[PDB]
Short mmCIF file of N, CA, C and O in Angstrom, two decimals:
data_model
loop_
_atom_site.label_atom_id
_atom_site.label_comp_id
_atom_site.label_asym_id
_atom_site.label_seq_id
_atom_site.Cartn_x
_atom_site.Cartn_y
_atom_site.Cartn_z
N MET N 1 120.62 -37.14 -67.44
CA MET N 1 121.52 -38.17 -68.04
C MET N 1 122.22 -38.94 -66.93
O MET N 1 122.69 -40.05 -67.14
N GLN N 2 122.27 -38.35 -65.74
CA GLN N 2 122.91 -38.99 -64.60
C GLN N 2 121.94 -39.07 -63.42
O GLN N 2 121.30 -38.09 -63.06
N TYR N 3 121.86 -40.26 -62.82
CA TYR N 3 120.97 -40.45 -61.68
C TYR N 3 121.73 -41.10 -60.52
O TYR N 3 122.85 -41.57 -60.69
N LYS N 4 121.12 -41.11 -59.35
CA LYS N 4 121.74 -41.69 -58.17
C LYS N 4 120.81 -42.71 -57.53
O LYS N 4 119.60 -42.49 -57.45
N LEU N 5 121.37 -43.82 -57.07
CA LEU N 5 120.56 -44.86 -56.43
C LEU N 5 121.07 -45.16 -55.03
O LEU N 5 122.10 -45.83 -54.87
N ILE N 6 120.35 -44.68 -54.03
CA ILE N 6 120.74 -44.92 -52.64
C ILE N 6 119.79 -45.93 -52.01
O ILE N 6 118.64 -45.60 -51.71
N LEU N 7 120.27 -47.15 -51.80
CA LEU N 7 119.44 -48.18 -51.21
C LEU N 7 119.98 -48.58 -49.84
O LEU N 7 121.07 -49.13 -49.72
N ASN N 8 119.20 -48.29 -48.80
CA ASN N 8 119.61 -48.63 -47.45
C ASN N 8 118.95 -49.93 -47.01
O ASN N 8 117.73 -50.00 -46.87
N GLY N 9 119.76 -50.96 -46.80
CA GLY N 9 119.24 -52.25 -46.37
C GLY N 9 119.14 -52.31 -44.85
O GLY N 9 119.58 -53.27 -44.22
N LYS N 10 118.56 -51.26 -44.27
CA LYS N 10 118.41 -51.18 -42.83
C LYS N 10 119.78 -51.21 -42.16
O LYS N 10 120.14 -50.30 -41.41
N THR N 11 120.54 -52.25 -42.45
CA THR N 11 121.87 -52.40 -41.89
C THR N 11 122.92 -52.26 -42.99
O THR N 11 124.12 -52.42 -42.74
N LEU N 12 122.46 -51.98 -44.21
CA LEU N 12 123.37 -51.84 -45.34
C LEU N 12 123.08 -50.57 -46.12
O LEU N 12 121.93 -50.28 -46.45
N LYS N 13 124.13 -49.81 -46.42
CA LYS N 13 124.00 -48.58 -47.17
C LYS N 13 125.02 -48.53 -48.30
O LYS N 13 126.17 -48.93 -48.12
N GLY N 14 124.60 -48.05 -49.47
CA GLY N 14 125.50 -47.97 -50.61
C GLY N 14 125.00 -46.97 -51.64
O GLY N 14 123.80 -46.87 -51.89
N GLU N 15 125.92 -46.23 -52.24
CA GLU N 15 125.56 -45.24 -53.25
C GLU N 15 126.38 -45.46 -54.52
O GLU N 15 127.57 -45.76 -54.46
N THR N 16 125.73 -45.31 -55.67
CA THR N 16 126.40 -45.50 -56.95
C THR N 16 125.88 -44.50 -57.98
O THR N 16 124.80 -43.93 -57.81
N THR N 17 126.65 -44.29 -59.04
CA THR N 17 126.25 -43.35 -60.08
C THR N 17 126.33 -44.01 -61.46
O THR N 17 127.25 -44.77 -61.75
N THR N 18 125.34 -43.71 -62.30
CA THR N 18 125.30 -44.28 -63.64
C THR N 18 124.74 -43.26 -64.63
O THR N 18 123.86 -42.47 -64.30
N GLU N 19 125.27 -43.27 -65.85
CA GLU N 19 124.82 -42.34 -66.88
C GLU N 19 124.00 -43.07 -67.94
O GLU N 19 124.54 -43.86 -68.72
N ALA N 20 122.70 -42.80 -67.97
CA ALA N 20 121.82 -43.44 -68.94
C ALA N 20 120.92 -42.40 -69.61
O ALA N 20 120.93 -41.23 -69.23
N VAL N 21 120.16 -42.84 -70.60
CA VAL N 21 119.26 -41.94 -71.32
C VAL N 21 117.81 -42.37 -71.12
O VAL N 21 116.89 -41.76 -71.66
N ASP N 22 117.62 -43.43 -70.34
CA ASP N 22 116.27 -43.94 -70.08
C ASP N 22 116.12 -44.32 -68.61
O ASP N 22 116.12 -45.49 -68.25
N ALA N 23 116.00 -43.30 -67.76
CA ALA N 23 115.85 -43.53 -66.32
C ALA N 23 114.57 -44.31 -66.03
O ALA N 23 114.52 -45.12 -65.10
N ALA N 24 113.54 -44.07 -66.83
CA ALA N 24 112.26 -44.75 -66.65
C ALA N 24 112.44 -46.26 -66.76
O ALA N 24 111.91 -47.02 -65.94
N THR N 25 113.19 -46.70 -67.76
CA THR N 25 113.44 -48.12 -67.97
C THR N 25 114.44 -48.65 -66.95
O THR N 25 114.24 -49.71 -66.36
N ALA N 26 115.52 -47.90 -66.75
CA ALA N 26 116.55 -48.31 -65.80
C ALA N 26 116.00 -48.38 -64.38
O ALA N 26 116.28 -49.32 -63.64
N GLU N 27 115.22 -47.37 -64.00
CA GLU N 27 114.64 -47.33 -62.66
C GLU N 27 113.78 -48.56 -62.40
O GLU N 27 113.82 -49.14 -61.31
N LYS N 28 113.00 -48.96 -63.39
CA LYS N 28 112.13 -50.13 -63.25
C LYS N 28 112.94 -51.41 -63.17
O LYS N 28 112.68 -52.27 -62.32
N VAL N 29 113.92 -51.55 -64.05
CA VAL N 29 114.77 -52.74 -64.07
C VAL N 29 115.55 -52.87 -62.77
O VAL N 29 115.69 -53.96 -62.22
N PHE N 30 116.07 -51.75 -62.28
CA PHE N 30 116.86 -51.75 -61.05
C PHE N 30 115.98 -52.10 -59.84
O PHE N 30 116.43 -52.78 -58.92
N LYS N 31 114.74 -51.63 -59.86
CA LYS N 31 113.82 -51.90 -58.76
C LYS N 31 113.56 -53.40 -58.63
O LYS N 31 113.68 -53.97 -57.54
N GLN N 32 113.21 -54.03 -59.74
CA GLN N 32 112.93 -55.46 -59.74
C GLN N 32 114.21 -56.25 -59.43
O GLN N 32 114.16 -57.30 -58.79
N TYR N 33 115.34 -55.73 -59.89
CA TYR N 33 116.62 -56.39 -59.65
C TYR N 33 117.03 -56.25 -58.18
O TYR N 33 117.47 -57.22 -57.56
N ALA N 34 116.88 -55.05 -57.64
CA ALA N 34 117.24 -54.80 -56.25
C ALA N 34 116.36 -55.64 -55.34
O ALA N 34 116.84 -56.28 -54.40
N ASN N 35 115.06 -55.64 -55.62
CA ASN N 35 114.12 -56.42 -54.82
C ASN N 35 114.51 -57.89 -54.83
O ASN N 35 114.46 -58.56 -53.80
N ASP N 36 114.89 -58.38 -56.00
CA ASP N 36 115.30 -59.78 -56.14
C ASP N 36 116.59 -60.03 -55.36
O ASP N 36 116.84 -61.15 -54.91
N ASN N 37 117.39 -58.99 -55.20
CA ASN N 37 118.65 -59.12 -54.48
C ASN N 37 118.42 -58.94 -52.98
O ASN N 37 119.35 -59.04 -52.18
N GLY N 38 117.17 -58.68 -52.61
CA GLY N 38 116.82 -58.49 -51.21
C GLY N 38 116.83 -57.02 -50.81
O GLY N 38 116.98 -56.69 -49.64
N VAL N 39 116.67 -56.13 -51.79
CA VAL N 39 116.66 -54.70 -51.50
C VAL N 39 115.23 -54.18 -51.42
O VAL N 39 114.54 -54.08 -52.44
N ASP N 40 114.79 -53.85 -50.21
CA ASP N 40 113.44 -53.34 -50.01
C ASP N 40 113.47 -52.01 -49.26
O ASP N 40 114.50 -51.62 -48.70
N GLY N 41 112.33 -51.32 -49.24
CA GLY N 41 112.22 -50.04 -48.55
C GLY N 41 111.24 -49.12 -49.26
O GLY N 41 110.27 -49.58 -49.87
N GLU N 42 111.48 -47.82 -49.15
CA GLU N 42 110.60 -46.84 -49.78
C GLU N 42 111.31 -46.14 -50.93
O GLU N 42 112.30 -45.44 -50.73
N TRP N 43 110.79 -46.33 -52.14
CA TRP N 43 111.38 -45.71 -53.32
C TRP N 43 110.54 -44.54 -53.79
O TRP N 43 109.32 -44.52 -53.61
N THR N 44 111.19 -43.55 -54.40
CA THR N 44 110.50 -42.37 -54.90
C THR N 44 111.31 -41.74 -56.03
O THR N 44 112.46 -42.10 -56.27
N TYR N 45 110.70 -40.78 -56.73
CA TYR N 45 111.37 -40.11 -57.83
C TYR N 45 111.60 -38.64 -57.51
O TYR N 45 110.68 -37.83 -57.55
N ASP N 46 112.85 -38.30 -57.19
CA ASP N 46 113.19 -36.91 -56.87
C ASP N 46 113.68 -36.18 -58.12
O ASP N 46 114.64 -36.61 -58.76
N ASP N 47 113.01 -35.09 -58.46
CA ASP N 47 113.38 -34.32 -59.64
C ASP N 47 114.35 -33.20 -59.28
O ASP N 47 115.22 -32.83 -60.08
N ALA N 48 114.21 -32.66 -58.07
CA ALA N 48 115.08 -31.59 -57.62
C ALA N 48 116.47 -32.12 -57.28
O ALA N 48 117.46 -31.39 -57.36
N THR N 49 116.54 -33.39 -56.89
CA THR N 49 117.81 -34.00 -56.53
C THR N 49 118.13 -35.18 -57.44
O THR N 49 119.09 -35.91 -57.22
N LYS N 50 117.31 -35.37 -58.47
CA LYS N 50 117.52 -36.47 -59.41
C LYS N 50 118.16 -37.66 -58.70
O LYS N 50 118.92 -38.42 -59.30
N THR N 51 117.86 -37.81 -57.41
CA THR N 51 118.42 -38.91 -56.63
C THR N 51 117.31 -39.82 -56.10
O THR N 51 116.20 -39.37 -55.81
N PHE N 52 117.62 -41.11 -55.99
CA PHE N 52 116.65 -42.08 -55.49
C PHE N 52 117.08 -42.62 -54.13
O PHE N 52 118.27 -42.76 -53.86
N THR N 53 116.11 -42.90 -53.27
CA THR N 53 116.41 -43.41 -51.94
C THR N 53 115.48 -44.56 -51.57
O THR N 53 114.29 -44.54 -51.88
N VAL N 54 116.03 -45.56 -50.89
CA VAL N 54 115.25 -46.72 -50.46
C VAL N 54 115.59 -47.07 -49.02
O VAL N 54 116.75 -47.28 -48.68
N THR N 55 114.57 -47.13 -48.17
CA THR N 55 114.78 -47.45 -46.76
C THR N 55 113.95 -48.66 -46.33
O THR N 55 112.72 -48.60 -46.32
N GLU N 56 114.64 -49.74 -45.97
CA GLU N 56 113.97 -50.95 -45.52
C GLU N 56 113.19 -50.70 -44.23
O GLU N 56 113.75 -50.07 -43.34
#
């Protein structure tokens, strides 16, 4: 119900928390949104840490 999104813009780092019931949909929407905002790197789906990380 709770996930984490860590996106490192090479020179920019930020962490946030959100409570949703559809990570599959949110994860996809956030990816396209982050990319559009200039957020790139390596994304993955961690089940043991239910946390996401992106490194430009």
